[PDB]
C-alpha cells in the first residue's frame, strides 16, 4: 500500500491523475519525484520551470554546481539529485525535444531511468513543451516501465483525451 489518491489504473503498474505535479508532491511527499530535464539542466519553463519555482530556485542551484562538475546530461539520461522540499529525490530525466528535432526513438530510453525506482511520481515524458504527441508518451510508458509509476497530468482536457483512448 501507497499514499497515492485517486489515481485510475491503466495497468499493472502504471497510474493516472488530474493533477498539478507540484501539488501532488507536496501532498504526497514521494521517495522519487521525475522532472521532465533538459540536458543543460536548466529549469525555465513547463514542469521543470514550476518545480524549481517550488523550491524557491534551489533545485535550480543544485542542478548548476551538478552541471559544473559532470557537464550535460544525455537525451534519454537522468541523474538522482535532491527532492528538496516536494519529495526525498528528484529524479531528472531528459526525454527528447522535438521542438529541437530530436530522435522520438529516444524516448525509450528516456523511460528506462524509471525502472532503476519501485516508485516514482512523474509527468509524461516528452510532452508539453517538449513537442512530443502525449497518447505516443503514455503508451511507451506503459510499454517500457515496470516499476510503479504515478503519472500526473496537469491539463484536464489532456487527461479525458488520455484515458478514453487508451488501449
Ligand atoms: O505535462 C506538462 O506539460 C506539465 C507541465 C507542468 C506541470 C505539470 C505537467 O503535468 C503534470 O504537472
Known amino acids: 500500500v501507497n499514499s497515492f489518491s485517486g489515481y485510475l489504473k491503466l495497468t499493472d503498474n502504471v497510474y493516472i491523475k488530474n493533477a498539478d505535479i507540484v501539488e501532488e508532491a507536496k501532498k504526497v511527499k514521494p521517495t522519487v519525484v521525475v522532472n ?3 540536458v543543460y539542466l536548466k529549469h525555465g ?18 542542478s548548476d554546481d551538478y552541471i559544473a562538475t559532470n557537464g550535460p546530461l544525455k537525451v534519454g539520461g537522468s541523474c538522482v539529485l535532491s527532492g528538496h522540499n516536494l519529495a526525498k529525490h528528484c529524479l531528472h530525466v531528459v526525454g527528447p525535444n522535438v521542438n529541437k528535432g530530436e530522435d522520438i526513438q529516444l ?47 496537469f491539463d484536464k482536457n489532456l487527461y479525458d483525451k488520455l484515458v478514453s483512448s487508451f488501449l
Open 45 to 62: 519553463g513547463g514542469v521543470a520551470g514550476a518545480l524549481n519555482k517550488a523550491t524557491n530556485n534551489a533545485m535550480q542551484v543544485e
Open 107 to 153: 524516448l525509450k530510453s528516456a523511460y528506462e531511468n524509471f525502472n532503476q525506482h519501485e516508485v516514482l511520481l512523474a509527468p509524461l515524458l516528452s510532452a508539453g513543451i517538449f513537442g512530443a504527441d502525449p497518447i505516443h508518451s503514455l503508451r511507451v510508458c506503459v510499454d517500457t516501465v515496470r516499476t510503479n509509476v504515478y503519472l500526473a497530468v
Open 36 to 38: 521532465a530535464a533538459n
